[PDB]
């Protein structure tokens, strides 16, 4: 059921995967707003090219 890491289910691995999930989530948000800044500058540069 769904994609799986196929990892050893233990409390240590549970904590490891919770930390990994938090890190990946904050990285997703981090890159999302980085990409927001980059696409804002990209739209600006497209306007400069256009005119």
């Amino acid at each position: 059921s769904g994609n799986r890491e196929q990892v050893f289910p233990t409390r240590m691995t549970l904590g490891l995967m919770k930390t990994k999930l938090k890190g990946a989530n904050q990285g997703y948000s981090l890159l999302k707003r980085k990409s927001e800044a980059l696409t804002k500058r990209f739209r600006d540069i497209t306007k400069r090219i256009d005119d």
Partner: protein, 593 residues
């Protein structure tokens, strides 16, 4: 008296034991195996045998001694190897030339043949004497020059006869007191139950640092004389280096090693370096063994001996604390002690709390750990001792989720956590700065103000730098180092320099086996000065890459500051550190223009 009714592993049920008391030692079987009562059900008493229980037959006698599991305290305790029940291993091997430990061997724990030079104390005939009073002194070692003979606690009376100065074997009468008509004879030694902590007049606040010599410990997470400490059991870390460092360089007047749950060959380890390690703080090259007694307890020994190892070791530490001696107890693995408790509770059919461990695990670790603090020893003359409990923990699965560490963290003031990211990369002593802590930082401000006034400030600065760079690294590992400001780059580089050249300690090198507290303080000064000058220079427009290339020389000087030999003396090393600091200031002033 009693007779065995049931045997199943170390648990033995003996009938006709109507008079037995809780935790009372009994002599089980014809071999007179040592065991203590664990449960009473009328005339039937559950007994955990401290030796191998095979061969026991239903009906053979069980004679109850009437005394709980006690430990012999007196001269001859030093320089000696013991098991959990304090059976002298060397004396056992000489009494029976066999390579094995004979079943039911009853050699006295402390040698009865050695004649000790006894010097009578202040008290004379007719003086009322109380528990803990020093009524005489004994020259045991060339290092423990004055082994003070204390009147046993919970014992007092009017002195009626005190032996004069001379040589006395351990069994000869020394002091004869009169309490109320009942008259007691006292010898060089006395027995004290290992379960009950030895009383003291007052427990003080442990306020003097226990210098381990590892820079990360003594700098970021310091311990104090009389504190409680948790260390990981992984070798190469402080489990094997910090024990030797504390035994060889620390200001402890005595060392008590308690190797409960030790591997067979790792036991043979600490029985050959300890006889071959020497001290310099005494003013002469003297072996540590004169300061040390070992409680050797391999993993194949009975589980009850594993449980009693910690108690007998801490009782020896308490006994040497009661003489006004700062004594450090090193427990090899309190996790193995916890597993011994778990196994015993399993044999007893008790309901476990978590992951099988007994519900009273936290209570037992507390009752063990709080036998540590600095104290004013019972009786007169006034004196002060301490027991620095330095107890290691072997993690389960490499996380702190195991119940042993969770219960330990609620007691220990100092916790030197492990970092497998540092351990796997062979960055020793590999202490997890993020999660390790020491609650003795505030208490040590009084010591720092007297000796090294800026030490807390620099320690907090290094912690701040390391935390900021840790979050910067976790951002970088996803984003990269491209977009960071120059100040962020300085933070990362300074923290890498710290981790590689201040926190990291070889331990097997002459220049860095023991980093003295003044050298550690000077190194913190140098590293914080590097960070401060780098940040100040970059604040004045200086590009970080150019500044780094032009100050690689002072970076190497800071890196190689760790290579200074501590044996050159505090004066020389401090002068050379001042030279390094002045050179750094001059170089950064030059390169900032």
């Amino acid at each position: 008296y009693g007779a065995i009714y049931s045997v199943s592993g170390p648990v033995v049920i003996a009938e006709n034991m109507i008079g037995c008391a809780m935790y009372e030692l009994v002599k089980v079987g014809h071999d007179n195996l040592v065991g203590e009562v664990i449960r009473i059900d009328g005339d039937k008493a559950t007994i955990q045998v401290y030796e191998e229980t095979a061969g026991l037959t239903v009906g053979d006698p069980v004679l109850r001694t009437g005394k709980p599991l006690s430990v012999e305290l007196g001269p001859g305790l030093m320089e000696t190897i013991y098991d959990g029940i304090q059976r002298p291993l060397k004396a056992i091997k000489e009494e029976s030339q066999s390579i094995y430990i004979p079943r039911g061997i009853d050699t006295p724990a402390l040698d009865r043949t050695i004649k000790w030079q006894f010097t009578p104390g202040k008290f004379q005939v007719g003086d009322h004497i109380s528990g803990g009073d020093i009524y005489g002194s004994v020259f045991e070692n060339s290092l423990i020059s004055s082994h003070k003979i204390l009147l046993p606690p919970r014992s007092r009376g009017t002195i009626t006869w005190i032996a004069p100065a001379g040589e006395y074997t351990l069994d000869e009468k020394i002091l004869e007191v009169e309490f109320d008509g009942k008259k007691s004879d006292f010898t060089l030694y006395h027995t004290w139950p290992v379960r009950v902590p030895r009383p003291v007049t007052e427990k003080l606040s442990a306020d003097y640092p226990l210098l381990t010599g590892q820079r990360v410990l003594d700098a970021l997470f310091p311990c104090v004389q009389g504190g409680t400490t948790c260390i990981p059991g992984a070798f190469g870390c402080g489990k094997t280096v910090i024990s030797q460092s504390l035994s060889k360089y620390s200001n402890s007047d005595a060392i008590i090693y308690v190797g409960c749950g030790e591997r067979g060959n790792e036991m043979a380890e600490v029985l050959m370096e300890f006889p071959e390690l020497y001290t310099e703080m005494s003013g002469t090259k003297e072996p540590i063994m004169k300061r040390t007694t070992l409680v050797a307890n391999t993993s194949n020994m009975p589980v009850a001996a594993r449980e009693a190892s910690i108690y007998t070791g801490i009782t020896l530490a308490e006994y040497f604390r009661d003489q006004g001696k700062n004594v450090s107890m090193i427990a090899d693995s309190s996790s193995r002690w916890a597993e011994a408790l778990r196994e015993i509770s399993g044999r007893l059919g008790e309901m476990p709390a978590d992951q099988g461990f007994p519900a009273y695990l936290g209570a037992k670790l507390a009752s063990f750990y709080e036998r540590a603090g600095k104290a004013v020893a019972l009786g007169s003359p006034d004196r002060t001792g301490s027991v620095s409990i330095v107890a290691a923990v072997s993690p389960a699965g490499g996380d702190f989720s195991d119940p042993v560490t969770t219960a330990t963290l609620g007691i220990t003031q100092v916790f030197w956590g492990l970092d497998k990211k540092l351990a796997q990369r062979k960055h020793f002593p590999s202490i997890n700065t993020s999660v390790s802590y020491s609650k003795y930082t505030n208490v040590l401000n009084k010591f720092y103000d007297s000796n090294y006034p800026e030490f807390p400030v620099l320690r907090d600065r290094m912690k701040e730098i390391l935390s900021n760079a840790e979050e910067l690294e976790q951002v970088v590992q996803l984003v990269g180092k491209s977009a960071l400001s120059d100040s962020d780059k300085i933070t990362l580089d300074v923290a890498t320099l710290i981790k590689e050249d201040f926190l990291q300690q070889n331990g097997y090198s002459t220049y860095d086996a023991f980093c003295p507290i003044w050298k550690t303080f000077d190194m913190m000064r140098a590293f914080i000065s590097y960070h401060d000058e780098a940040q100040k220079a970059v604040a004045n427009g200086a590009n970080w890459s150019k500044l780094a290339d032009s100050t690689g020389d002072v970076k190497h000087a800071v890196s190689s500051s760790k290579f200074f030999e501590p044996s050159r003396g505090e004066k020389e090393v401090h002068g050379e550190f001042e030279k390094l600091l002045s050179t750094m200031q001059e170089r950064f002033a030059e390169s900032t223009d």
